[PDB]
Amino acid sequence: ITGTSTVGVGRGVLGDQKNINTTYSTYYYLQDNTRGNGIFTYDAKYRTTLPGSLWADADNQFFASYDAPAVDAHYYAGVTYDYYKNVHNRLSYDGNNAAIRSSVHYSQGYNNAFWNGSQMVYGDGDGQTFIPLSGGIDVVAHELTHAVTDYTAGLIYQNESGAINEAISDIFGTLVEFYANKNPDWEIGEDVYTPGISGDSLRSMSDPAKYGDPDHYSKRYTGTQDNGGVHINSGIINKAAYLISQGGTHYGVSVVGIGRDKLGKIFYRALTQYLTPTSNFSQLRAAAVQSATDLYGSTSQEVASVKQAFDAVGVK
Ligand SMILES: NCCc1cccnc1
Ligand SMILES: [Ca+2]
Ligand SMILES: [Ca+2]
Ligand SMILES: [Ca+2]
Ligand SMILES: [Ca+2]
Ligand SMILES: [Zn+2]
């Protein structure tokens, strides 16, 4: 909407206070005009119609329990925008400052969040499996990264290309979590998953098998569930990315780590220059090798480490 840019204050899902960019016109709206063509957050009001209503607040203070998922969806979309702009010189998900839209309070007890091709959508969780999913910065950034993928490589959401799609979202979700530097880790969703259980998460990149996901191509899922295992076989690529960044020995193969920043540069370049809608795991390895060659040189440690990491997970 048309109005003037303002700064509100609120509390997120985890009870932390933060400032949020709003717009004043009669009401204060969750519309951040400081980033691209705007970040807009909507109330789905427990329904499944989307987007719902642009979030309106009478006083620019967002401390009600009902406000918390909206505060975090809005704020973490801003952090994710900042990561892509400041780290990769990418302006929003399309590279042209497309407006970023999110809806919260989607459905009732909905234990998921997603990018729907047009916008991000967050359930509130059922209070046992999840609390409202926008409380996880890695979740928010995972979702917005699907939009980046859609506009770049276009990886089809099935089988190996879909597992790459998922892993790219986990990788950049994690790199955004490190960028914000609040309790960063290599696990996915820990801040919103199972409030009654400490120390768990949906997935681990450092040890995918902790939650039943494969960490070697020989253990890949070959069935039809989950669009051919897109959230399962992602563990093979997540493990490779973890090894590239942090190093380690895995099934007897040693990888010299090169750090998170170079991991991000290599995978961002692979995603935006080399991957295609039908890329498989072997093609991802080649894309990563070529990206590291472009950035660091063919004889570099970085190229050598990409090769050892894919070797370690059984991808040639
Ligand atoms: N992401 C968990 C995949 C899975 C499910 C059930 C048993 N083993 C593995
Ligand atoms: Ca208020
Ligand atoms: Ca964390
Ligand atoms: Ca995490
Ligand atoms: Ca938990
Ligand atoms: Zn995903």
Sign of the torsion formed by the C-alpha atoms of 219, 281, 307 and 147: negative
Q: Tokens representing 297?
A: 């040189």
Q: Residue 163 burial by CB count (10 A; 0-12/13-18/19+): exposed, middle or buried?
A: buried
Binding residues: 57, 59, 61, 138, 142, 146, 166, 177, 183, 185, 187, 190, 193-194, 197, 200
Taking each continuous run of H as one helix and of E as one strand, the counts in the chain are 8, 15
Q: Residue 86 burial by CB count (10 A; 0-12/13-18/19+): exposed, middle or buried?
A: exposed
What is the 5 CA–ligand 4 centroid distance (Å)? 31
CA angle 241, 77, 99 (to 5 degrees): 115
- Report the distance separating Cα 281 and Cα 303, nearest Å: 17
Q: What is the resolution of this structure in A?
A: 1.3
CA-based R_g, the chain, Å:
19
Instruction: Tell me the backbone φ, ψ of residue 189, rounded to 5 degrees.
Output: 85, 10
Has 231 been annotated as catalytic? yes
Fill in the DSSP letter of residue 279. -
Q: Tokens representing 234?
A: 């992602």
Q: Tokens representing 78?
A: 């801003």
**Annotated catalytic residue: which of 105, 143, 160, 302?**
143
- Report the distance separating Cα 278 and Cα 310, nearest Å: 19
Judge if the beta carbon of residue 232 lies within 6 A of ligand 1: yes
Half-sphere exposure of 175 (CA within 13 A, CB side): 31
Could you tell me the CA-to-CA distances from 96 to 11, 38, 40, 81, 92 in Å, in that order? 31, 12, 16, 12, 6
Judge if the beta carbon of residue 212 lies within 6 A of ligand 1: yes
For residues 230 and 168, is the Cβ–Cβ distance under 8 A?
no
- Report the distance separating Cα 184 and Cα 232, nearest Å: 22
- Please tell me the number of the ligand nearest to residue 58's CA: 2
For residues 232 and 268, is the Cβ–Cβ distance under 8 A?
no
What is the 59 CA–ligand 2 centroid distance (Å)? 5
Could you tell me the CA-to-CA distances from 141 to 68, 94, 148, 173, 284 in Å, in that order? 18, 15, 10, 4, 21
Per-residue burial over 26-35, b if 16 or more Cβ lie within 10 Å, else e, is ebbbbbbbeb
Has 302 been annotated as catalytic? no
